[PDB]
Amino acid sequence: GYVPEDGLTAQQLFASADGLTYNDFLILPGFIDFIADEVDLTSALTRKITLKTPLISSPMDTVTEADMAIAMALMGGIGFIHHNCTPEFQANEVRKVKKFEQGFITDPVVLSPSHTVGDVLEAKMRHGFSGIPITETGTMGSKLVGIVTSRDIDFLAEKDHTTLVMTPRIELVVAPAGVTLKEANEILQRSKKGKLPIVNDCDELVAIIARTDLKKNRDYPLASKDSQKQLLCGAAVGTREDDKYRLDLLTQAGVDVIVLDSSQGNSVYQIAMVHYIKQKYPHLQVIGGNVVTAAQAKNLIDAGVDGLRVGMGCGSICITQEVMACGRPQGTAVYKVAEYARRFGVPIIADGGIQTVGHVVKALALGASTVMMGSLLAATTEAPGEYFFSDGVRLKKYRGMGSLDAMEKVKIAQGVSGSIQDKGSIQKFVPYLIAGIQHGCQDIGARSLSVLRSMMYSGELKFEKRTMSAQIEGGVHGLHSYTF
Amino acid sequence: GYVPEDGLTAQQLFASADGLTYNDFLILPGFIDFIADEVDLTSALTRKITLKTPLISSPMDTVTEADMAIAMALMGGIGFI
Ligand SMILES: NC(=O)c1ccc[n+]([C@@H]2O[C@H](COP(=O)([O-])OP(=O)(O)OC[C@H]3O[C@@H](n4cnc5c(N)ncnc54)[C@H](O)[C@@H]3O)[C@@H](O)[C@H]2O)c1
Ligand SMILES: Nc1ncnc2c1ncn2[C@@H]1O[C@H](COP(=O)(O)OP(=O)(O)OP(=O)(O)O)[C@@H](O)[C@H]1O
Ligand SMILES: Nc1ncnc2c1ncn2[C@@H]1O[C@H](COP(=O)(O)OP(=O)(O)OP(=O)(O)O)[C@@H](O)[C@H]1O
Ligand SMILES: O=c1[nH]cnc2c1ncn2[C@@H]1O[C@H](COP(=O)(O)O)[C@@H](O)[C@H]1O
């Protein structure tokens, strides 16, 4: 039973009242008894919502729209759709996530027999495809009369702009009502076709599978789905009266969780808004914030929030501390707010400052249930906006929501705008995060993130501060030149 | 009336006798109950003189002659020639 005493407990580490951040300490290693792949990353987002992975995309206009949210839900986490856009735009982005299904086409392009072949060529050059079904109305939920594709069009000269060419319903292969992707794989295997339309018992079109998107099928075991098996989506909302309308559209779009978005969440405006939400939409889960101290947390927890977002001025793009002298170092803040919130069963989100895998493991060890990343997920294929080149390298634009560029679309800049280098894809990079989090938990000695926090609260997890010198030595040093 | 205690008071912050400057600390946020425009900046310069804003131009030969002093007074502060 004797384990020699070596290191500080988390309570002793934070008892000197220095402003510690993630880089100021290290976690001491424990006793390995299991492989890194055995580590369970299951995480509470709110009082009722549980994820299979701790990771969250930040509600920022350069990070999180429906494609980022779909990629994050599928990889095991969740995404929060930003709100620097019209209420109807945001509800449409949520509705795209909530009505996504794997291998099926989302929001199909469709035409009618009175359209011209020129409409197929234009929908190509603005979308990039041409396998477009034909219906009696030209819309959807309407009789499937035939299909048009590039091999129906490719030998027509520019002399010809005929009305719809169309191979008719009598010749099609279709699915009858709704199918698992195995029956779709066998229909597209046995038929050699590029599309599989899906119809109703009354022969309306209702969905499509493309052969290309079916061939790109893969397993998603951590899919992060609601009770009706649709992906989880969150959305951000403000605290003004204009937000009460937006909140209704997001509710109709089927949003699962709302995150009230402020820099200082301990206001009368946010408490009013939380009481309004819990009294109008009692099914809806609310994350308040941002808060850095336990007194802010206490006000919001009495207001009835289901989770807290923790952070103020630690963000990569942030300059709030330099202009208003208000904030807290992020390690200290995460520890204190999470310790207070745990007395009520409320999970917190450690939001901001994350740059490495060690920062994620450190934040999770200090009591955070989930981790929100802006810059770490920015410049992926799934992030909003489009790439550009400068100094011979691919970049994407990343900006603070209180930067002048973000808020112009007397006023004080709380944030900055700048470049981030291309990361590739969420579907390829989130696995690097998950594998690194699991190996860090394995070196620490925790078989799950729940056990990690339980070891930290009981004093079994030990810590160690770092001088400047120890941070220098913990880097790369003494080399002439080296690889990334 | 319970407010959880989190952070140092100004007396505890300066009780360790380090040489702190402005960049060495932060102020912790409180409880908003009013809009930013409602904040009163009225300030005592001396035992008798009160300004409507805390700002003063330094008495330096590259900062404050009569035009700087006029602008500073008009904007709410004062200047020292
Ligand atoms: N790291 C951070 O915590 C941090 C720091 C700065 C900005 N931001 C981000 O910038 C964006 C803008 O947020 P913000 O910081 O401007 O705060 P905000 O938008 O919540 O509020 C801005 C100002 O309007 C006031 N206000 C809000 N609701 C009001 C109401 N109903 N009636 C009257 N006044 C009201 C606030 O008190 C504040 O003075 C958000 O995306 C936010 O997350 C985040
Ligand atoms: N009618 C459609 N509506 C919406 N998206 C579509 C439609 N047809 C194809 N797509 C999408 O376009 C992408 C490429 O599909 P596909 O390979 O089948 O293109 P295509 O229709 O054959 O066009 P092309 O002849 O130019 O290659 C896939 O993601 C697919 O889901
Ligand atoms: N589900 C289907 N059932 C029957 N015929 C179909 C079906 N889908 C496409 N067709 C028809 O099959 C032919 C080939 O279309 P398909 O989508 O398979 O290839 P394409 O996209 O036109 O050609 P390619 O892949 O070479 O670019 C066209 O005449 C088209 O109208
Ligand atoms: O303009 C801004 N100023 C201050 N903080 C911001 C701003 N925009 C976003 N943030 C915060 O930055 C976090 C992301 O930080 P990052 O992961 O370090 O890039 C977000 O979740 C917000 O809390």
Swiss-Prot record, chain A:
Positions with a binding annotation for K(+): G313, G315, C318, E473, G474, G475
Expression tissues: IMP type I is the main species in normal leukocytes and type II predominates over type I in the tumor.
Domain CBS stretches: 104-163, 166-224
InterPro entries hit by this protein: Aldolase_TIM, CBS_dom, IMP_DH, IMP_DH/GMP_Rdtase_CS, IMP_DH_GMPRt
Associated disease: Retinitis pigmentosa 10: A retinal dystrophy belonging to the group of pigmentary retinopathies. Retinitis pigmentosa is characterized by retinal pigment deposits visible on fundus examination and primary loss of rod photoreceptor cells followed by secondary loss of cone photoreceptors. Patients typically have night vision blindness and loss of midperipheral visual field. As their condition progresses, they lose their far peripheral visual field and eventually central vision as well. Leber congenital amaurosis 11: A severe dystrophy of the retina, typically becoming evident in the first years of life. Visual function is usually poor and often accompanied by nystagmus, sluggish or near-absent pupillary responses, photophobia, high hyperopia and keratoconus.
Reported function: Catalyzes the conversion of inosine 5'-phosphate (IMP) to xanthosine 5'-phosphate (XMP), the first committed and rate-limiting step in the de novo synthesis of guanine nucleotides, and therefore plays an important role in the regulation of cell growth. Could also have a single-stranded nucleic acid-binding activity and could play a role in RNA and/or DNA metabolism. It may also have a role in the development of malignancy and the growth progression of some tumors.
Protein's name in the database: Inosine-5'-monophosphate dehydrogenase 1
Swiss-Prot record, chain B:
Organism from which the protein derives: Homo sapiens
Function in brief: Catalyzes the conversion of inosine 5'-phosphate (IMP) to xanthosine 5'-phosphate (XMP), the first committed and rate-limiting step in the de novo synthesis of guanine nucleotides, and therefore plays an important role in the regulation of cell growth. Could also have a single-stranded nucleic acid-binding activity and could play a role in RNA and/or DNA metabolism. It may also have a role in the development of malignancy and the growth progression of some tumors.
Name the UniProt record assigns to this protein: Inosine-5'-monophosphate dehydrogenase 1
Further remarks about this protein from its record: Because IMPDH activity is tightly linked with cell proliferation, it has been recognized as a target for cancer and viral chemotherapy and as a target for immunosuppressive drugs. The activities of the antitumor drug tiazofurin, the antiviral drug ribavirin, and the immunosuppressive drugs mizoribine and mycophenolic acid (MPA) are attributed to the inhibition of IMPDH. In addition, bacterial and parasitic IMPDH's differ significantly from mammalian enzymes, which makes it a suitable target for anti-infective drugs.
Portion of the parent chain present: 11 to 91 of 514
Recorded disease: Retinitis pigmentosa 10: A retinal dystrophy belonging to the group of pigmentary retinopathies. Retinitis pigmentosa is characterized by retinal pigment deposits visible on fundus examination and primary loss of rod photoreceptor cells followed by secondary loss of cone photoreceptors. Patients typically have night vision blindness and loss of midperipheral visual field. As their condition progresses, they lose their far peripheral visual field and eventually central vision as well. Leber congenital amaurosis 11: A severe dystrophy of the retina, typically becoming evident in the first years of life. Visual function is usually poor and often accompanied by nystagmus, sluggish or near-absent pupillary responses, photophobia, high hyperopia and keratoconus.
Protein family (similarity comment): Belongs to the IMPDH/GMPR family.
Subunit structure, interactors included: Homotetramer.
Induction of the gene: Constitutively expressed.
